[PDB]
């Protein structure tokens, strides 16, 4: 039953990172300042008259030094285990894994944490 333990751990990992996202949004205050990771954080306001919307608040969310690293760690383990299962079980088909709609959500929500390591300004 070791395979069931692996999926149970992965299920715990996915619910843990979603809750850590809640922890982030609870401790992320935009009015203090929103910017690109250090220098130039810029305060913002919303104008109902001007139809243009500023994307910097949406594009940018402040992440704590502890929070960004632990999410990267959790994402990597979830990334490791899912492709541990993918490489473990082929069952006579190498294709069709990405068209089943679970690979896209796993990959699009995980590797961005991997690429943020390369660029400190993108954390």
UniProtKB/Swiss-Prot annotation:
Which ranges make up the Extracellular topological domains here? 37-63, 119-123
Q: Which residues cross the membrane?
A: 4-36, 64-88, 103-118
List locations, semicolon-separated.
Answer: Cell membrane
Expression (tissue specificity): Highest expression in liver, brain and spinal cord. Lowest expression in skeletal muscle.
- Assembly and interactions? Homotetramer; which constitutes the Na(+)-activated K(+) channel. Interacts with KCNT2; these heterodimer channels differ from the homomers in their unitary conductance, kinetic behavior, subcellular localization, and response to activation of protein kinase C. Interacts (via C-terminus) with FMR1; this interaction alters gating properties of KCNT1. Interacts with CRBN via its cytoplasmic C-terminus.
Disease involvement: Developmental and epileptic encephalopathy 14: A rare epileptic encephalopathy of infancy that combines pharmacoresistant seizures with developmental delay. This severe neurologic disorder is characterized by onset in the first 6 months of life of refractory focal seizures and arrest of psychomotor development. Ictal EEG shows discharges that arise randomly from various areas of both hemispheres and migrate from one brain region to another. Epilepsy, nocturnal frontal lobe, 5: An autosomal dominant focal epilepsy syndrome characterized by childhood onset of clusters of motor seizures during sleep. Some patients may develop behavioral or psychiatric manifestations and/or intellectual disability. The phenotype is more severe than observed in other genetic forms of nocturnal frontal lobe epilepsy.
Q: What is the role of the protein in this entry?
A: Sodium-activated K(+) channel. Acts as an important mediator of neuronal membrane excitability. Contributes to the delayed outward currents. Regulates neuronal bursting in sensory neurons. Contributes to synaptic development and plasticity.
Domain comment quoted from the record: The cytoplasmic gating ring domain of the closed KCNT1 channel harbors multiple K(+) and Zn(2+) sites, which stabilize the channel in the closed conformation. Under low-Na(+) conditions, the abundant cytoplasmic K(+) ions stabilize the gating ring domain in a closed conformation. KCNT1 contains at least two Na(+)-sensitive sites in the RCKs domain where Na(+) binding induces expansion and rotation of the gating ring that opens the inner gate. The cytoplasmic N-terminal domain facilitates the localization of heteromeric KCNT1/KCNT2 channels to the plasma membrane.
Report what the protein is called.
Potassium channel subfamily T member 1
State the organism's lineage: Eukaryota, Metazoa, Chordata, Craniata, Vertebrata
The protein's gene is named: KCNT1
Tell me the part of the parent protein that is shown: 91 to 213 of 1230
